[PDB]
């Protein structure tokens with residue numbers, strides 16, 4: 001249940017990395033998880049972050065909102081590099097989705 | 110002293126002075142206040158025109174000319190009204206586009222109220238246009254009214270009901286004057302309800318990301334941003350009134366009444382063009398009017414088709430391309446709606462009609478889903 | 487057909503002339519007040 | 534509605550700012566602005582512009598066919 005690497009996977013990665021650059025949130029210093037739409041599952045995931053991450057995301061978002069108002073971007077040297085982009089919210093979000101889905105399955109019986 | 114305690118200024122303060130607003134809202138956000146200015150504009154000039162217009166079949170066309178020739182400055186007031194109606198639609202369009210692009214429709218209630226506000230002003234402008242009893246006013250009134258006749262089983266009792274007769278005549282011009290006078294007051298109430306629901310969450314912004322960490326007071330900032338932008342709405346309005354009074358105005362309304370003779374090529378106002386093309390595309394009575402209704406009523410399905418993990422389209426290259434293809438498609442519908450129902454045009458007009466719906470009901474939502482996958486979300 | 491024709495363009499003149507005064511001025515009023523935000527600087531200093 | 538003081542929690546960020554009467558309202562209006570607009574233009578042309586040239590091309594063709602097909606036409610009816 002493992003071995004493979006592929007020139008193709010790199011193409012897929014290359015297509016993702018391409019879109020990531022095209023999306024452009026990294027020009028504002030943002031990270032992927034900073035751009036997620038806050039629905040309830042998400043608000044709760046934000047709520048569960050430890051202080052450091054919680055604070056970092058706040059500052060990044062402020063930095064971006066401030067750029068947006070000036071319609072500027074960060075120097076290229078400071079864009080968030082795909083692959084240096086931390087999925088910090090994911091595991092909390094996945095867990096909050098799991099527990100909700102559990103509640104839902106209980107509500108069915 | 111205080112703005113905060115007085116039962117009245119407290120509303121003002123909470124709506125225009127201390128309301129926390131995103132530091133980053135764009136020019137695209139100016140349209141809501143411009144829509145308010147439009148409504149007030151229509152209201153004032155509308156009113157002064159009512160102090161001189163008469164609603165009877167005979168003197169209708171005439172009283173309007175009385176205004177443009179005899180009544181002091183009626184011409185300027187009349188043109189501001191007409192050109193104000195166009196601006197109002199220009200603003201609706203931008204405002205609705207801004208909401209789509211930026212995901213603002215996710216504020217369910219306020220977006221749903223907006224749709225109602227859209228239909229209300231369209232109803233309003235229609236009744237308005239009929240008022241001078243010109244050729245297009247009459248035939249346009251005849252076309253649009255007859256749509257209702259497509260409705261199965263009760264279709265004809267309804268048109269005759271709304272007519273107050275056997276065709277658009279006397280009774281209709283008078284009732285249209287009446288409904289056209291009250292509608293903007295009713296619009297005004299819906300707009301306050303629109304603004305109420307919006308304040309519950311405050312404004313969205315270009316990034317689609319919460320701005321609670323970077324809110325600024327509506328007052329000094331949006332107060333001046335709105336002023337500046339009002340002056341721009343005004344320049345654009347005056348340019349029309351003062352240099353191109355007849356530019357959007359069809360030459361045929363400058364000729365009275367002909368229930369006997371339909372003009373060779375009747376052409377909608379402008380802001381109905383795209384919808385007119387859609388209705389026309391399909392060679393069916395029922396299906397045309399159904400397609401027509403759906404063409405506008407679709408806005409309320411938009412929220413169910415949101416598929417992306419992001420709110421705005423700011424970081425969404427695919428959706429962006431499809432959005433503009435939508436705009437470009439509407440612009441095509443506009444061109445086509447103003448053209449004769451013939452060879453190159455009917456086919457172009459049918460393909461643009463499937464595209465409009467194809468891209469809203471299927472293309473956009475599929476782009477959102479592949480953008481998510483591309484991001485590993 | 488259009489008796490107002492001549493007054494309208496005299497007004498029209500005044501509208502561009504006035505607009506050409508007010509536009510730059512109102513624009514400058516807004517930049518003045520927005521100065522504070524446009525040049526503001528941020529710094530994050532976590533523990 | 535929501536009020537300043539009850540929006541959200543923020544820790545550790547300093548904001549430095551100047552009085553309007555102390556700064557310029559248009560600093561490098563052209564020096565920095567022009568470059569900036571060129572840059573925002575580049576960033577969006579590929580998404581905005583194409584659908585419109587597509588309409589443009591169909592606009593000119595469409596009218597071209599219309600004229601040549603109906604009016605101009607009466608082509609051959611030879612006897």
Ligand code: HEM
Nearest residue numbers: 151152155156158159162194197233234237238240290293
């Ligand atoms: C305060 C409520 C309103 C009143 C009392 C009012 C009054 C009038 C009157 C008396 C006319 C016939 C005179 C003329 O044609 O110039 C008219 C025409 C019209 N009004 Fe209104 N109106 C009101 C709100 C609106 C609204 C909301 C709109 C939509 C923006 C609107 C757009 C029109 C249009 C398109 C016409 C036909 C203009 C033309 O070409 O002559 N008005 N209105």
Ligand code: HEM
Nearest residue numbers: 138139140141142144208213219220223224226227300313
């Ligand atoms: C009488 C017609 C309308 C009036 C008077 C009106 C007025 C306003 C005002 C004052 C705002 C505040 C900020 C801004 O400028 O964006 C706003 C925002 C908004 N309106 Fe309207 N609008 C009208 C038509 C519509 C329509 C047709 C829709 C959608 C069908 C709509 C849905 C929204 C939404 C979703 C927002 C959210 C703000 C954002 O996300 O940026 N409104 N409107």
Ligand SMILES: C[C@@]1(c2ccc(Oc3ccccc3)cc2)OC(=O)N(Nc2ccccc2)C1=O
Nearest residue numbers: 231234235238249250252376377378380381384
């Ligand atoms: C101004 C106008 C009008 C006003 C509001 C409308 O409302 C809508 C606008 C867009 C989409 C749906 C409805 C439609 C037409 O009223 C009117 O008599 N016409 N003229 C007309 C000409 C040919 C066919 C049908 C109508 C309008 O354009």
